[PDB]
From a paper:
There are three parts to the flagellar structure: the trans-membrane basal body that functions as the motor, the connecting rod and hook, and the flagellar filament that acts like a helical propeller. Our current understanding of supercoiling in bacterial flagellar filaments, referred to as polymorphic switching, is based upon the notion that protofilaments within the flagellar filament can exist in two discrete states, that differ slightly in length. The “short” state results from a protofilament having a right-handed inclination (the R-state), while the “long” state results from a protofilament having a left-handed inclination (the L-state). To reconstruct filaments at high resolution, all protofilaments must be “locked” into the same state, either L- or R-type, producing straightened filaments that lead to non-motile bacteria.
While the three L-type mutants (E115G, S285P, and S17P) have a left-handed 11-start helix, the four R-type mutants (N226Y, A233V, H84R and A39VN133H) have a right-handed 11-start helix, and the designations L and R correspond to the hand of these 11-start helices. The L-type 11-start helices are tilted left by ~ 1.7° and the R-type 11-start helices are tilted right by ~ 3.9°. The first atomic filament model (R-type H84R) was built de novo using an established Rosetta protocol, and the other filament models were built by RosettaCM32 using the H84R model as the starting template. As a result, the H84R filaments adopt a right-handed form. We also identified several straight mutations that are only involved in the 11-start interactions: S17P, H84R and A39V in the double mutants.
Numbering used by the authors:
A (entry chain W): 52 to 254
B (entry chain M), E (entry chain A), G (entry chain K): 255 to 304
C (entry chain A), F (entry chain K), H (entry chain J): 3 to 51
D (entry chain g): 52 to 152
Write the structure that this text describes.
């Protein structure tokens, strides 16, 4: 009994610790979401300034956007909880090889297998993900915007220099971040629920 | 967040720890009372001698 | 009956009430009910969009 | 007499122990009930967002719900009183075969 | 209109949330008082020993 | 008359009173009369619904 | 309205329940005093032996 | 629970609100939303031109 009791309280501590890890990652992704919001604003504004302003001004917009990218990588790589750099692709959700997923095992209960799995990925190349991001598309859209001159070259009828494609893929990156944050919120709800059961059982 | 984890390791929950303080004291007081009872047997041994 | 008192539902409900009050402030100081993705994950995603 | 006396007090201890087992299971089911409450909320909200929001957003709601499911299984399988995993279907109320209840 | 919906998801109704704050606090204070009553039984146990 | 004193109604009523006081705190610290399904099973189910 | 009914099932009237808490405690204290009186008869039995 | 209180989301949201109010005045006293290049870098460059 005692074994499982003290082990159970320790498991609850472990769970709260997992929650706070999620708090750090969640804050990083919150800020990432603010960045991507600003990016989308610049994409829309770039969209009209395919008429209004020149490749010089579009290049200024690109300066800002590229800086914002560099910050996204900066979040992905500086973000550490007790040194744990998470947002990097080390903890990809599902590699081609399941052996290389590097899944995250939080211990949750006192006994064997009373644990879970967690994964995460966001970085510069977090645009639309097929299995890789893609080649000329779905990677730069987060990393290197097309907002250099290429909107002055053509409207949305190209899909590689088209405005619609651009805006779409940005919105999809947003949907991946939003999805990740949503999952994490669910997970910490799960954890808290469990911690209630752990403390109860402990009593 | 790190502050929270730090505290969970470092900061004691002084409610529970107060209860443990209470408990350990009363166990000490009780224990002493048990000594005061323990050390009275020999004097009735003396009553057998006296 | 005192090696392990039974008044731990007391402490657990206490940590729960204090947890709640904390969350309350986290909402009020910020002015949000979605200050954290565990408050409302679904509505968070929606609100994002 | 003595036989039945000490046996009787032991039986009462045994009964209290059974109660506390029930306390554990009851707490697990309390939490399960909170989960299911949240689920129902998401179902209602999903109901109106058959108009308001898209299959992407419904998919986000599904992400949360699926997580909550996974927690229900997590309760059913992590829940143990001295190792006794109860909520699992091992102790089904009434199998087709009464021998396997 | 979208601002309204955003707020209904995001913005808390701080009136109700204030009332919940009030409530949770007083439940905490009450709970602590119940601890202060809980931890006084053992000392009358001592009175049985002493 | 002392191998087994008759003052066990004393102790049983004592454990009963202490049990009651425990339950009282369990209600007061939480603020519920249904903190546990044995308090009121029927009303629990209803309240659920 | 449903909140009201919910509370009437769920929410305890902590005034009355406080009074019940008071009562149960004092019954415990009294009971213990009755034990302290109960367990003093045997020692006058000893006075008959001694 | 008091060696390190958990009421730091309080202070962080406070410094954030005060930061915002500062920025608000910086805009209002000047009468600009581009008083500083971090407000809007892109629109700053454009506005320059």
């Amino acid at each position: 009994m005692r074994g499982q009791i003290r082990g159970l309280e320790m498991a609850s501590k472990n769970s709260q610790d997992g929650i706070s890890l999620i708090q750090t990652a969640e804050g990083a992704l919150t800020e990432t979401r603010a960045i991507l919001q600003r990016v989308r604003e610049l994409v829309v504004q770039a969209g009209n300034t395919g008429t209004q302003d020149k490749a010089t001004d579009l290049q200024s917009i690109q300066d800002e956007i590229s800086a914002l990218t560099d910050e996204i990588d900066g979040i992905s790589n500086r973000t550490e909880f007790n040194g744990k750099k998470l947002l990097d692709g080390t903890y990809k959700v599902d590699t081609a090889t399941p052996a290389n997923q590097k899944n995250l095992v939080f211990q949750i209960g006192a006994n064997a297998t009373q644990q879970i799995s967690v994964n995460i990925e966001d970085m510069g190349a977090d645009a639309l993900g097929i299995k890789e991001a893609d080649g000329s598309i779905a990677a730069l859209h987060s990393v290197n915007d097309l907002d250099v001159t290429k909107f002055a070259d053509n409207a949305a009828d190209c899909a590689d220099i088209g405005f619609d494609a651009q805006l779409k893929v940005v919105d999809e990156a947003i949907n991946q971040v939003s999805s990740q944050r949503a999952k994490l919120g669910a997970v910490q709800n799960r954890l808290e629920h469990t911690i209630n059961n752990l403390s109860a059982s402990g009593e | 967040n790190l502050t929270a984890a730090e505290s969970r390791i470092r900061d004691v929950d002084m409610a529970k720890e107060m209860s443990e303080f209470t408990k350990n004291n009363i166990l000490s007081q009780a224990s002493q009372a048990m000594l005061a009872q323990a050390n009275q047997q020999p004097q009735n041994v003396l009553q057998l001698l006296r | 009956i005192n090696h392990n008192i039974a008044a731990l539902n007391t402490l657990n409900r206490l940590s729960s009430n204090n947890s709640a009050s904390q969350k309350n402030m986290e909402k009020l100081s910020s002015g949000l009910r979605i200050n954290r993705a565990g408050d409302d994950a679904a509505g968070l995603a929606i609100s994002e969009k």
